[PDB]
Amino acid sequence: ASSGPAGCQVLWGVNQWNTGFTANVTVKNTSSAPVDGWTLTFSFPSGQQVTQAWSSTVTQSGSAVTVRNAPWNGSIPAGGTAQFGFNGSHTGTNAAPTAFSLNGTPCTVG
């Protein structure tokens, strides 16, 4: 980025039962813009086979990931937060990386 995009962040709220880690994520934008829906992306380190999702149009590309959070559940102002989650099967390893990237901007986990 040869300019100065955003730099939001997202926290993780894992909840693994037997096998199926349900990640309760909460987006946090603070850069400076009316977030009326968005599309972040990064990749699952281990084999987080995500499948069930809500309040987020998740999409696993082979092994990577992307989430297009709807406009309604994505109506958070520059200094606000959003939230979504899903249920994926794990194996006991790294689940959430570090700084993912909103639709065109980085985002440090929380």
UniProtKB/Swiss-Prot annotation:
Disulfide bonds join 8-107. Residues 1-110 form the CBM2 domain. Hydrolyzes both cellulose and xylan. Also has weak endoglucanase activity. The linker region (also termed 'hinge') may be a potential site for proteolysis. Belongs to the glycosyl hydrolase 10 (cellulase F) family. This is Exoglucanase/xylanase.
